[PDB]
């Protein structure tokens, strides 16, 4: 007599992992800048979500001028400034699980930089 | 008569290891800067959430100019000055679990900076 | 009379590594710079979702100007300036179960900038 809508299920899980072997063997570990190491380890994500989730996204943009006249023997300069009903250069990174490495990285090597507005 | 919606559901987890054997043998263990090291050594992570969630995100921008003339005889500059309705230059990173490492960095290198504005 | 809709179901989980074995013999084991090792180590990720989410996105953008008369005798400069109705150099990097590596990086390596306005 089951109804099920938009939803997980697992059951049973077993592990055994009882009787394996690991060795290593050195004169020296040397492990340096962001290594990550894993000997004999377990790591174990599960994930069990329910589902009929929702993202709702609203970008809405009216833009208006009214002039009779505009730049009437003048000067008018627009510069890097757009008109967007959204974002500006984002960066998204999304994962849901993870065992090793996520990196979102920004690193401009820059040696100058110049604004001059000279009316 | 069962029903179920938007449902997460995880039965029964066994875990058995015993006699399980790990070994590490050096003269030295030397890890330096953000070294991880998992030895015979269990990181779980469960996540079993109900659904039916929501997340509502809204923009509205209404930008309006009214003018009898502009700028007359005049200099007008809109530098840089966007009219967005949304997010500039955002950084999203999104992970749900992790038994790792998660980073997000800036790390520009920027000898000098000028903006100079002379009306 | 069962019915499943729009939903993920596994069943039963067994797992039997018993009796595995793994050995590393060196003189020296040097690991530097963003290295991940896994030396008889596991990891699992198990994803049962329920189905059935949404995601909207909408962008409106209305965009008008009313004028009799428009730079009658000036200079009217509109530059790298779009209406876009959307996003503006987005980037997306998507993934669900990652055992291994994720990197969005950015690393322009660039001497000079110049912006110059000058009415």
Chains 1, 2, 3 share one sequence.
Do not use: C, W
Request: glycine residues 10%; aromatic residues 2%; proline residues 4%.
């Amino acid at each position: 007599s089951k109804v099920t809508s938009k939803s997980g299920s697992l059951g049973n899980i077993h592990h055994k992992p009882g009787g394996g072997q690991v060795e290593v063997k050195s004169e020296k570990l040397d492990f340096k800048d962001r290594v990550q190491s894993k000997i004999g380890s377990l790591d174990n994500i599960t994930h069990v979500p329910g589902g009929g989730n929702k993202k709702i996204e609203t970008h809405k943009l009216t833009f208006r001028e009214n002039a009779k006249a505009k730049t009437d023997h003048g000067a008018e300069i627009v510069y890097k400034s757009p008109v967007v009903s959204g974002d500006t250069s984002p960066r998204h990174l999304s994962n849901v699980s993870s065992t090793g490495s996520i990196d979102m990285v920004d690193s401009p090597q820059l040696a100058t930089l110049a604004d001059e507005v000279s009316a």
